[PDB]
Amino acid sequence: EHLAPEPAEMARLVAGTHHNPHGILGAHEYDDHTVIRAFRPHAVEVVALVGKDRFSLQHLDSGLFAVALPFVDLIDYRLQVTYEGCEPHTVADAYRFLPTLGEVDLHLFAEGRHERLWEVLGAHPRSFTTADGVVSGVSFAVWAPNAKGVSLIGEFNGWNGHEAPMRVLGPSGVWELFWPDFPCDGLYKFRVHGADGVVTDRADPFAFGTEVPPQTASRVTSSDYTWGDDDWMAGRALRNPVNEAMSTYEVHLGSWRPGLSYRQLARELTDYIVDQGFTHVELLPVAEHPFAGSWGYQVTSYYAPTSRFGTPDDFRALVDALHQAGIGVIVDWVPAHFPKDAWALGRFDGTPLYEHSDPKRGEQLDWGTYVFDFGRPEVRNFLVANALYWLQEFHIDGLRVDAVASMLYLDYSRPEGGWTPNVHGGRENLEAVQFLQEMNATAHKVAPGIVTIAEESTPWSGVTRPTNIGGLGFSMKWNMGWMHDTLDYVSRDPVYRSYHHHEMTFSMLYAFSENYVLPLSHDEVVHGKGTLWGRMPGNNHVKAAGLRSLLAYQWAHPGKQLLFMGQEFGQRAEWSEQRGLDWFQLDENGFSNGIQRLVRDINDIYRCHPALWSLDTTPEGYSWIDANDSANNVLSFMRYGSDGSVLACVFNFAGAEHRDYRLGLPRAGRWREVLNTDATIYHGSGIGNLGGVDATDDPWHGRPASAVLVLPPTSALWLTPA
């Protein structure tokens, strides 16, 4: 009776709903005689090979085969399946191998505290030395607690095989399987039989490699890449970004220069950034995403760089090249977005596994909007380990998390009938908060010197406050208020700016309540908002002057900077990832070359003048010269470095020049004019002070000394003591 399993088991094995294939398949001893079974539908001949005896052959059931035959122990053997049109092939029996995942790793995962989860889950090539020699293949592991079964499918199965069922490892919910001689770079998917009876073919949540979109299969990927950035990595651990220079060039890899691969970008993008003077590059989501129109935010393979531009190692070469050129690399990380594709993460095991669940069928306030269940240990681990993954496996220097507000709040609908303030269970998602704190604390602990950046649109405070005192633990946050007030102000015609002077200086009131990055990102130059150039008032010459002023203002204002590709040369039309950037503008007889030149100059002054970045987070690094000259639309202030250095910045937002303008200063003597956005080299009108001014001992604006100078119209002047 112990030759062919019972009908119930046999039915499950053929329907792919057996939880423990290895219990039936492989070699099993009943009383004495060792029985060997192999499941391979549409097979013609199996036969087992023991030592030097072909002593076997099998042939019963509806796809199953059994050897039976006496003698015990056996100790290693090999099968030789055969089909029509093809020749036999001797392969080791997968179901004879022990689990390729230890109890310890599973325990850490169950607790949601495995810091190197990527080495445990997913597809990893492995080799075992048995009796008849060493056997190589690939180990597979997927988390799916409520699935009735998971089978491995791929090119070898015609993407519809059944002879590769996986087993679940106890109550862990993790399915495992070692497939002898599976291709080192083979494509594959996990056919999942959900708890709801629905079968789905899934990409691997831990895919380290992927098929090029629109294809959706995962690809086994193992790296042995040799990095040439040891110096950069060792240096990074000894610095604190918050107190260092940070001029960021935000880039979307697919549309910066359409058609470039990672290897080409490793040359072109690196050289571009170096020549423009940026200290860092911030990349829009690099993880695999099926739709380019999402710009990368709708990720499906969190553990794999998009294959559109090359292989993972090719991506490492891009990061490696930037590092050797002295450029830091920040990547947009998307824990706030949840994959909606049926072959991705939604209802993975037939239940809302990864996404936060809610009440069952019925009316009430139950909607969709898929968000990760930060309350679940394994889901939290999936995300926290992914952050660590990119920082350690790809040497990424920082992570920027968008839409954090959508993570911190469960909110919806404004109640009626309840006119009383009720706390208890506020709108705050305590699970998400705990998740962000863990992610930050763990990341900064494992990779000192990296930065985590958050974009939070709500009045939430302590975003960049240490986790040990209630903060979310982020190194920095986007100053959205500065961006909105600044762009609203510069968009208004000069004759009206006086009415919004207070709007322009409002950001200074809380500029030190957090470690800020002043941003002018991709989101502000799409969907009818127009570009920075489009927002500027006046003719081409005045728009250009206004843009050069804005950028100078962004750089001088307390906080780090971030500028989206194309805007450094005043791209006129809104960004389009489908058309690419408007580089032709640099070939026109326009102002674009002049704006790009200004950015190079402010970046150059910036990097070499600690007064612009050493004291960004404290009032000590700033000082108003005159915050109340709304009558002339002029803003002036000092920036101070931790090395005692200084820089005076004067912005003239009026459309006309101001001659004989007296500016109060800290010291007397000669002040060198290090920047004048009206200089003819930028294609301004050339109004200036001839390189510098002499500050006399005539007190002004409550200052001990002052100097008389001309302020070019719609411009910015920066000065430093000679």
Side-chain angles (χ1 to χ4, degrees):
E1 190 69 356
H2 280 300
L3 189 60
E6 299 307 302
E9 294 286 282
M10 177 60 48
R12 292 171 68 200
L13 196 62
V14 307
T17 58
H18 200 301
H19 75 98
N20 184 35
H22 302 59
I24 296 175
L25 286 44
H28 297 75
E29 301 190 304
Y30 303 79
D31 187 3
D32 171 68
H33 54 299
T34 58
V35 178
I36 300 179
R37 309 193 187 70
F39 182 55
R40 285 144 200 289
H42 299 176
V44 173
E45 176 178 58
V46 181
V47 185
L49 315 183
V50 186
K52 285 177 173 174
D53 291 60
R54 205 142 188 170
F55 162 72
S56 285
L57 299 115
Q58 312 150 55
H59 75 305
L60 80 171
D61 262 349
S62 305
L64 193 68
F65 299 74
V67 191
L69 296 168
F71 91 73
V72 298
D73 298 296
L74 180 54
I75 306 175
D76 184 52
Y77 58 87
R78 210 189 311 176
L79 307 180
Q80 201 187 73
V81 195
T82 304
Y83 302 77
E84 289 186 56
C86 192
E87 296 178 53
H89 199 67
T90 65
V91 195
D93 180 40
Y95 302 91
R96 166 224 151 186
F97 285 82
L98 293 171
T100 52
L101 297 186
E103 226 66 67
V104 178
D105 292 311
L106 291 173
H107 180 260
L108 286 177
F109 174 55
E111 288 185 296
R113 48 181 286 224
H114 200 307
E115 309 198 324
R116 316 213 74 182
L117 190 56
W118 59 86
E119 303 186 312
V120 176
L121 296 176
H124 299 88
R126 304 202 61 180
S127 292
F128 301 89
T129 175
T130 60
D132 299 7
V134 61
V135 180
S136 296
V138 177
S139 159
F140 296 87
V142 224
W143 182 57
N146 308 287
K148 294 293 168 278
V150 184
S151 299
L152 172 75
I153 60 174
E155 179 260 64
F156 70 123
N157 284 182
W159 298 94
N160 193 64
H162 264 288
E163 14 66 12
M166 299 173 77
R167 57 170 159 196
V168 76
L169 300 174
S172 70
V174 176
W175 297 79
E176 182 272 353
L177 174 62
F178 175 57
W179 205 246
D181 307 299
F182 187 89
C184 292
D185 50 54
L187 297 180
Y188 71 96
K189 275 185 176 172
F190 290 128
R191 176 177 291 293
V192 177
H193 292 70
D196 65 339
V198 177
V199 183
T200 66
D201 288 337
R202 304 278 180 164
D204 181 349
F206 268 84
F208 302 126
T210 69
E211 214 174 358
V212 185
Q215 295 316 302
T216 57
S218 300
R219 180 194 298 291
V220 179
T221 307
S222 58
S223 180
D224 63 317
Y225 183 80
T226 306
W227 297 85
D229 66 343
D230 288 341
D231 300 321
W232 169 274
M233 296 302 280
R236 185 186 74 183
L238 307 171
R239 298 195 303 278
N240 184 352
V242 172
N243 299 147
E244 304 290 327
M246 183 178 273
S247 195
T248 324
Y249 188 51
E250 184 189 29
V251 180
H252 174 262
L253 296 188
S255 68
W256 182 62
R257 281 177 194 185
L260 298 193
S261 65
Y262 289 125
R263 293 284 173 172
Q264 290 175 305
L265 286 161
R267 285 281 134 63
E268 289 195 44
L269 181 55
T270 305
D271 285 1
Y272 187 73
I273 298 175
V274 166
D275 297 330
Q276 262 24 77
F278 289 96
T279 63
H280 299 73
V281 63
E282 178 163 296
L283 307 170
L284 272 73
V286 298
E288 192 58 85
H289 48 287
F291 182 45
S294 69
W295 302 333
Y297 295 90
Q298 298 187 62
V299 175
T300 47
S301 296
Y302 278 81
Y303 288 87
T306 184
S307 54
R308 256 169 294 235
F309 316 119
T311 64
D313 279 352
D314 284 331
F315 178 60
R316 292 189 171 80
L318 170 55
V319 172
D320 198 355
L322 286 156
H323 281 353
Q324 293 185 59
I327 314 306
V329 185
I330 306 166
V331 174
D332 275 358
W333 191 51
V334 296
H337 296 75
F338 188 88
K340 55 194 180 185
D341 302 286
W343 48 272
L345 297 175
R347 295 176 69 69
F348 199 76
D349 65 1
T351 73
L353 190 62
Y354 285 90
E355 63 274 58
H356 192 183
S357 296
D358 36 63
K360 64 174 177 297
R361 312 160 76 176
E363 56 161 3
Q364 289 293 52
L365 333 179
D366 265 55
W367 61 90
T369 308
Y370 288 46
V371 298
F372 279 107
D373 183 354
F374 311 109
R376 208 199 275 242
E378 294 94 335
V379 173
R380 188 166 63 239
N381 203 347
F382 172 76
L383 293 178
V384 167
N386 190 62
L388 303 177
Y389 176 72
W390 290 94
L391 300 173
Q392 296 181 297
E393 285 299 300
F394 286 91
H395 293 194
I396 299 307
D397 307 289
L399 301 165
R400 181 197 72 109
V401 182
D402 64 307
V404 167
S406 69
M407 295 179 104
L408 301 172
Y409 298 108
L410 312 136
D411 66 1
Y412 144 77
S413 170
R414 44 216 126 187
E416 303 198 65
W419 302 283
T420 60
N422 308 306
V423 189
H424 207 182
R427 313 182 195 184
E428 311 181 62
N429 184 334
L430 278 52
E431 283 60 54
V433 167
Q434 204 295 310
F435 158 61
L436 293 172
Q437 297 177 306
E438 189 179 318
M439 181 283 289
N440 280 136
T442 310
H444 287 286
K445 176 187 70 183
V446 175
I450 58 92
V451 296
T452 53
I453 307 171
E455 169 271 293
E456 174 78 55
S457 66
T458 64
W460 194 296
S461 60
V463 175
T464 65
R465 191 175 193 175
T467 296
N468 54 62
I469 55 181
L472 294 179
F474 281 103
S475 312
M476 320 175 159
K477 76 166 294 195
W478 276 23
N479 196 324
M480 299 304 270
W482 171 87
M483 173 261 106
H484 183 285
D485 301 326
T486 299
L487 292 187
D488 178 59
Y489 175 93
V490 296
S491 292
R492 296 205 171 77
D493 184 67
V495 304
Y496 298 117
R497 290 179 175 182
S498 287
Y499 303 156
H500 301 80
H501 191 81
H502 69 290
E503 172 182 48
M504 191 67 148
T505 70
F506 196 82
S507 69
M508 285 314 303
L509 301 174
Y510 61 84
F512 309 115
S513 66
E514 300 262 33
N515 296 321
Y516 292 111
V517 165
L518 305 186
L520 293 187
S521 72
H522 64 289
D523 289 311
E524 309 315 313
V525 297
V526 292
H527 304 153
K529 300 184 180 189
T531 56
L532 299 180
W533 167 280
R535 296 182 204 243
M536 302 304 145
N539 63 14
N540 299 329
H541 180 280
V542 173
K543 281 181 163 296
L547 178 40
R548 297 194 303 285
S549 290
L550 169 59
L551 300 184
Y553 175 71
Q554 170 179 27
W555 259 246
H557 188 289
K560 314 305 171 184
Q561 305 88 53
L562 175 143
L563 184 68
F564 188 63
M565 52 179 226
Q567 299 302 290
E568 75 278 22
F569 62 76
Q571 174 167 296
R572 305 190 288 274
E574 285 178 21
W575 169 53
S576 169
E577 59 90 1
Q578 305 203 63
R579 299 186 280 102
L581 295 180
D582 301 325
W583 295 97
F584 67 78
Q585 279 189 40
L586 285 184
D587 289 305
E588 299 178 305
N589 223 180
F591 301 86
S592 302
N593 297 273
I595 293 160
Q596 187 190 55
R597 183 170 301 107
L598 171 94
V599 173
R600 280 198 286 285
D601 287 346
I602 57 177
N603 267 328
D604 177 62
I605 291 166
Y606 178 77
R607 277 181 287 112
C608 300
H609 289 62
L612 286 174
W613 49 253
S614 64
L615 298 183
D616 275 315
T617 60
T618 170
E620 290 310 303
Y622 183 93
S623 185
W624 278 116
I625 288 182
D626 189 12
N628 304 297
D629 192 350
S630 58
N632 284 135
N633 293 153
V634 174
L635 282 188
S636 55
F637 61 81
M638 305 294 293
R639 285 308 306 283
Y640 296 113
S642 57
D643 59 342
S645 64
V646 69
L647 184 78
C649 312
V650 187
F651 298 83
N652 174 10
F653 292 112
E657 65 168 59
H658 291 134
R659 287 253 159 193
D660 300 300
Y661 188 93
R662 186 174 292 290
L663 175 78
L665 291 167
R667 323 176 188 180
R670 185 69 174 181
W671 282 71
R672 173 192 164 208
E673 195 180 60
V674 307
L675 187 79
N676 179 343
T677 64
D678 196 49
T680 76
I681 58 165
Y682 305 126
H683 293 166
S685 64
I687 293 169
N689 295 282
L690 294 174
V693 295
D694 296 298
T696 61
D697 294 304
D698 285 292
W700 199 255
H701 283 322
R703 298 289 180 166
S706 69
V708 171
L709 46 58
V710 53
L711 305 178
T714 315
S715 80
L717 294 179
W718 291 2
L719 318 164
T720 57

Coordinates of all heavy atoms in Angstrom, one line a residue, residues 525-557:
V525 N 7.4 70.9 -11.5 CA 7.5 71.2 -12.9 C 6.8 70.3 -13.8 O 7.2 69.9 -14.9 CB 9.0 71.4 -13.3 CG1 9.6 72.5 -12.5 CG2 9.7 70.0 -13.0
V526 N 5.6 69.8 -13.4 CA 4.7 68.9 -14.2 C 3.3 69.3 -13.9 O 3.0 70.1 -13.0 CB 5.0 67.4 -13.7 CG1 6.3 67.0 -14.1 CG2 4.8 67.3 -12.2
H527 N 2.4 68.7 -14.7 CA 0.9 68.9 -14.5 C 0.4 70.3 -14.4 O -0.3 70.6 -13.5 CB 0.5 68.1 -13.2 CG 0.9 66.7 -13.2 ND1 1.1 66.0 -12.0 CD2 1.1 65.8 -14.2 CE1 1.4 64.7 -12.3 NE2 1.4 64.6 -13.7
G528 N 0.8 71.1 -15.4 CA 0.3 72.5 -15.4 C 0.9 73.5 -14.5 O 0.5 74.6 -14.5
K529 N 1.8 73.1 -13.6 CA 2.4 74.0 -12.7 C 3.4 74.9 -13.4 O 3.9 75.9 -12.9 CB 3.1 73.3 -11.6 CG 2.1 72.4 -10.7 CD 2.9 71.8 -9.5 CE 2.0 70.9 -8.7 NZ 2.6 70.5 -7.5
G530 N 3.8 74.4 -14.6 CA 4.8 75.2 -15.4 C 6.2 74.9 -14.8 O 6.3 74.3 -13.7
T531 N 7.2 75.3 -15.5 CA 8.6 75.1 -15.0 C 9.0 76.3 -14.2 O 8.2 77.2 -14.0 CB 9.6 75.0 -16.2 OG1 9.4 76.2 -17.1 CG2 9.3 73.8 -17.0
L532 N 10.2 76.4 -13.7 CA 10.7 77.6 -12.9 C 10.8 78.7 -13.9 O 10.4 79.9 -13.5 CB 12.1 77.3 -12.3 CG 12.2 76.1 -11.3 CD1 13.6 76.0 -10.8 CD2 11.2 76.3 -10.1
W533 N 11.2 78.5 -15.1 CA 11.3 79.5 -16.1 C 9.9 80.0 -16.5 O 9.7 81.3 -16.5 CB 11.9 78.9 -17.4 CG 11.8 79.8 -18.6 CD1 10.7 79.9 -19.4 CD2 12.7 80.7 -19.1 NE1 10.9 80.9 -20.4 CE2 12.1 81.4 -20.2 CE3 14.0 81.1 -18.7 CZ2 12.8 82.4 -21.0 CZ3 14.7 82.1 -19.5 CH2 14.1 82.7 -20.6
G534 N 8.9 79.1 -16.7 CA 7.6 79.5 -17.0 C 6.9 80.4 -15.9 O 6.1 81.3 -16.2
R535 N 7.3 80.2 -14.7 CA 6.7 81.0 -13.6 C 7.3 82.4 -13.5 O 6.6 83.3 -13.0 CB 7.0 80.3 -12.2 CG 6.4 78.9 -12.0 CD 6.7 78.4 -10.6 NE 6.6 76.9 -10.6 CZ 5.7 76.3 -9.8 NH1 4.8 76.9 -9.1 NH2 5.7 74.9 -9.8
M536 N 8.5 82.6 -14.0 CA 9.1 83.9 -14.0 C 8.4 85.0 -14.9 O 8.0 84.7 -16.0 CB 10.6 83.8 -14.5 CG 11.4 82.9 -13.6 SD 11.4 83.3 -11.9 CE 11.5 81.7 -11.2
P537 N 8.2 86.2 -14.3 CA 7.5 87.2 -15.1 C 8.5 88.0 -16.0 O 9.7 88.0 -15.8 CB 6.9 88.1 -14.0 CG 8.0 88.0 -12.9 CD 8.3 86.6 -12.9
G538 N 7.9 88.7 -17.0 CA 8.7 89.5 -17.9 C 9.1 88.8 -19.2 O 8.6 87.7 -19.6
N539 N 9.9 89.5 -20.0 CA 10.4 89.0 -21.3 C 11.5 87.9 -21.1 O 11.8 87.7 -19.9 CB 10.9 90.1 -22.2 CG 12.1 90.8 -21.7 OD1 12.8 90.3 -20.8 ND2 12.5 91.9 -22.3
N540 N 12.0 87.3 -22.1 CA 13.0 86.3 -22.0 C 14.2 86.7 -21.1 O 14.7 85.9 -20.3 CB 13.5 85.8 -23.3 CG 12.4 85.2 -24.2 OD1 11.5 84.6 -23.6 ND2 12.5 85.3 -25.5
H541 N 14.6 87.9 -21.3 CA 15.8 88.4 -20.5 C 15.5 88.6 -19.0 O 16.3 88.2 -18.2 CB 16.2 89.8 -21.1 CG 17.4 90.4 -20.4 ND1 17.3 91.0 -19.2 CD2 18.7 90.4 -20.7 CE1 18.5 91.4 -18.8 NE2 19.4 91.0 -19.7
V542 N 14.3 89.0 -18.7 CA 13.9 89.2 -17.3 C 13.5 87.8 -16.7 O 13.7 87.6 -15.5 CB 12.7 90.1 -17.2 CG1 12.1 90.2 -15.8 CG2 13.1 91.5 -17.7
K543 N 13.0 86.9 -17.4 CA 12.7 85.6 -16.9 C 14.0 84.9 -16.5 O 14.1 84.4 -15.4 CB 12.0 84.7 -18.0 CG 10.5 84.9 -18.2 CD 10.0 83.9 -19.3 CE 8.5 83.8 -19.4 NZ 8.0 83.3 -18.1
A544 N 15.0 85.0 -17.4 CA 16.3 84.5 -17.1 C 16.9 85.0 -15.9 O 17.5 84.3 -15.1 CB 17.2 84.7 -18.4
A545 N 16.8 86.4 -15.8 CA 17.4 87.1 -14.6 C 16.7 86.6 -13.4 O 17.4 86.3 -12.4 CB 17.3 88.5 -14.8
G546 N 15.4 86.5 -13.4 CA 14.7 86.0 -12.3 C 15.0 84.6 -11.9 O 15.2 84.3 -10.7
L547 N 15.2 83.7 -12.8 CA 15.6 82.4 -12.5 C 17.0 82.3 -11.9 O 17.2 81.6 -10.9 CB 15.5 81.5 -13.7 CG 15.9 80.0 -13.5 CD1 15.4 79.5 -12.2 CD2 15.4 79.2 -14.7
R548 N 17.9 83.1 -12.4 CA 19.3 83.1 -11.8 C 19.2 83.6 -10.4 O 19.9 83.1 -9.5 CB 20.2 83.9 -12.6 CG 20.5 83.4 -14.1 CD 21.7 84.1 -14.7 NE 21.6 85.5 -14.8 CZ 20.9 86.2 -15.6 NH1 20.1 85.6 -16.5 NH2 20.9 87.6 -15.6
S549 N 18.3 84.5 -10.1 CA 18.1 85.1 -8.8 C 17.6 84.1 -7.8 O 18.0 83.9 -6.7 CB 17.2 86.3 -8.8 OG 17.7 87.4 -9.5
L550 N 16.5 83.3 -8.3 CA 15.9 82.3 -7.5 C 16.9 81.3 -7.1 O 17.0 80.9 -5.9 CB 14.8 81.7 -8.3 CG 14.2 80.4 -7.7 CD1 13.6 80.7 -6.4 CD2 13.1 79.8 -8.7
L551 N 17.7 80.7 -8.0 CA 18.7 79.7 -7.7 C 19.7 80.3 -6.7 O 20.0 79.6 -5.7 CB 19.3 79.2 -9.0 CG 18.3 78.6 -10.0 CD1 19.0 78.0 -11.2 CD2 17.5 77.5 -9.2
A552 N 20.2 81.5 -6.9 CA 21.1 82.1 -6.0 C 20.5 82.1 -4.6 O 21.1 81.8 -3.6 CB 21.5 83.4 -6.4
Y553 N 19.2 82.5 -4.6 CA 18.5 82.6 -3.3 C 18.3 81.3 -2.6 O 18.5 81.1 -1.4 CB 17.1 83.3 -3.5 CG 16.2 83.3 -2.3 CD1 16.5 84.2 -1.3 CD2 15.1 82.5 -2.2 CE1 15.7 84.2 -0.1 CE2 14.3 82.5 -1.1 CZ 14.6 83.4 -0.1 OH 13.8 83.4 1.0
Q554 N 18.0 80.2 -3.4 CA 17.9 78.9 -2.8 C 19.2 78.4 -2.2 O 19.2 77.8 -1.1 CB 17.5 77.9 -4.0 CG 17.6 76.4 -3.6 CD 17.1 75.5 -4.7 OE1 17.2 75.9 -5.9 NE2 16.6 74.4 -4.4
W555 N 20.3 78.7 -2.9 CA 21.7 78.3 -2.4 C 22.1 79.1 -1.1 O 22.7 78.5 -0.2 CB 22.7 78.5 -3.5 CG 23.1 77.3 -4.3 CD1 24.4 76.7 -4.3 CD2 22.3 76.5 -5.1 NE1 24.4 75.6 -5.1 CE2 23.1 75.5 -5.6 CE3 21.0 76.6 -5.5 CZ2 22.7 74.5 -6.5 CZ3 20.5 75.6 -6.4 CH2 21.3 74.6 -6.9
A556 N 21.8 80.4 -1.1 CA 22.2 81.2 0.1 C 21.3 81.0 1.3 O 21.8 81.2 2.4 CB 22.2 82.7 -0.3
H557 N 20.0 80.7 1.1 CA 19.1 80.5 2.2 C 19.5 79.3 3.0 O 19.8 78.2 2.5 CB 17.7 80.3 1.6 CG 16.6 80.3 2.6 ND1 16.4 79.3 3.5 CD2 15.6 81.2 2.8 CE1 15.3 79.5 4.2 NE2 14.8 80.7 3.8

